[PDB]
Chains A and B, each alone.
Chain A
Amino acid sequence: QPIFLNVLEAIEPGVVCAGHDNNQPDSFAALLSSLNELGERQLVHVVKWAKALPGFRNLHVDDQMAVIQYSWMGLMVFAMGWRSFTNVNSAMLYFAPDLVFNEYRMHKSRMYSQCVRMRHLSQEFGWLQITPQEFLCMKALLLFSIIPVDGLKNQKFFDELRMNYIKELDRIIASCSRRFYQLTKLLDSVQPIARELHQFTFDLLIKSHMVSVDFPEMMAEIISVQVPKILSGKVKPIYFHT
């Protein structure tokens, strides 16, 4: 109904496959190399999606790029949690049609706790009965949910944009605004997951040669250049709740 929702529905990325070889045995190396490839492929989609959001061109160019490079983990985790919810009713992690994690794969990836964290998020979409429209608004807000403590190049354009995406989430909600407590709480719950995954992928990149885990070009650069800004505390999520 809003022009806003029209736009979010129209630009929502479609299916992305990982290219995983489902004939080879599950192995840390094969599973994580396919996750890394998936990330690279999804990142192409996230860029094209983000550039198409209402107001996104408002930002300075370096701020457009920064915000994508900080927020892609949260975004992709949130969208994967939704895929899992809608395809397999949260029973397994639907990273892609050719890379669905069962318990066994959760274990083999050496990321079990984190997977459980993500399956939990996924169950939340069920337990809270989140709508497609709430989902799209919430995902758009995650793009604007992590920034350098010292601010962006043009911080005022970012603030205005984030303020308006909050207003939009509020509009598709509008005792009732207990929903807002919960949706904001659910949004916050993405961040600690993303942080754990940021530490995991960082350590994995450092030790990648020794474990034959393959990182694609743009993933290696981003995980070595931007991700450490997060881990070092230079760049931090915006939480709703303290």
Chain B
Amino acid sequence: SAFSRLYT
């Protein structure tokens, strides 16, 4: 996910 990439 683009979210998980942003987060981690």
Interface digits, A195-239 against B, CB 8 Å rule (1 contact, 0 not)? 000000000000000000000011001100100000000000000
A44 interfacial by beta-carbon distance below 8 Å: yes
A189 interfacial by beta-carbon distance below 8 Å: no
A47 interfacial by beta-carbon distance below 8 Å: yes
Give Cα A217–Cα B4 distance, bound, in whole angstroms.
12
Q: Which residue from chain A places its CB closest to the CB of B7 in the assembled complex?
A: A65
Chain A interface extent, by class: 10 to 19
Chain B interface main SS type = helix
A173 interfacial by beta-carbon distance below 8 Å: no
Q: Which residue from chain A places its CB closest to the CB of B8 in the assembled complex?
A: A61
Task: Find out whether the CB atom of B7 lies under 8 angstroms from the CB atom of A47.
Answer: yes
Give Cα A68–Cα B1 distance, bound, in whole angstroms.
14
Give Cα A217–Cα B6 distance, bound, in whole angstroms.
11
Q: Which residue from chain A places its CB closest to the CB of B1 in the assembled complex?
A: A221
Interface residues of A in 45-86 (CB under 8 A from B): 47, 61, 64-65, 68-69
Chain B residues whose C-beta falls within 8 Å of the C-beta of A222 in the assembled complex: 3
Task: Find out whether the CB atom of B3 lies under 8 angstroms from the CB atom of A69.
Answer: yes
Chain B residues whose C-beta falls within 8 Å of the C-beta of A65 in the assembled complex: 3-4, 7
Task: Find out whether the CB atom of B6 lies under 8 angstroms from the CB atom of A221.
Answer: no
Give me the interface of A with B, judged by CB distance under 8 Å. 43-44, 47, 61, 64-65, 68-69, 217-218, 221-222, 225
Give me the interface of B with A, judged by CB distance under 8 Å. 1-4, 6-8
Show 20 A/B contacts (Cβ-Cβ < 8 Å), sorted by A: A43-B6, A44-B6, A47-B6, A47-B7, A61-B8, A64-B7, A65-B3, A65-B4, A65-B7, A68-B7, A69-B3, A217-B2, A218-B2, A218-B3, A218-B6, A221-B1, A221-B2, A221-B3, A222-B3, A225-B1
